[PDB]
Amino acid sequence: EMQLTPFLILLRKTLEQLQEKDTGNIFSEPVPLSEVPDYLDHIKKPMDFFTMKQNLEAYRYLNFDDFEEDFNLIVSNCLKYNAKDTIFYRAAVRLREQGGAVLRQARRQAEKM
Numbered sequence: 001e002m003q004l005t006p007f008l009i010l011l012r013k014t015l016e017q018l019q020e021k022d023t024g025n026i027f028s029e030p031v032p033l034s035e036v037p038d039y040l041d042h043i044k045k046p047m048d049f050f051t052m053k054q055n056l057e058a059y060r061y062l063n064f065d066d067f068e069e070d071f072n073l074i075v076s077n078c079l080k081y082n083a084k085d086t087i088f089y090r091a092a093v094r095l096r097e098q099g100g101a102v103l104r105q106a107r108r109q110a111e112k113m
């Protein structure tokens with residue numbers, strides 16, 4: 001029960017803030033399946049920030065939960081695929097931690113709409 005335009009503006013800003021936390025840009029684009037041929041064997045739904053941007057503009061995110069669900073996929077897919085002693089796994093933990101704070105503040109602002 002809100003206006004579409006300000007909500008999408010908020011999701012755009014939020015997505016930019018989450019990308020800022022991924023300083024290595026390891027989640028910016030889809031996991032390269034040509035370099036990771038076994039990736040789809042374990043990961044049923046790949047996700048990344050570029051795909052999230054396309055979904056946002058395609059109106060796939062009309063509430064905060066669906067936006068946050070795809071962010072959580074970025075994190076959980078990486079924790080699942082990679083061993084704990086890898087940079088990838090630790091980067092996903094760090095993104096979960098730093099991204100969670102970004103998301104809580106942004107959801108509060110959506111709730112004011």
Ligand SMILES: Cc1cc2nnc(C)n2c2ccccc12
Binds near residue numbers: 027031032078082088
């Ligand atoms: C191999 C690999 C594994 C991997 N797991 N999660 C992510 C994100 N990745 C990558 C991202 C960019 C390039 C390679 C990978």
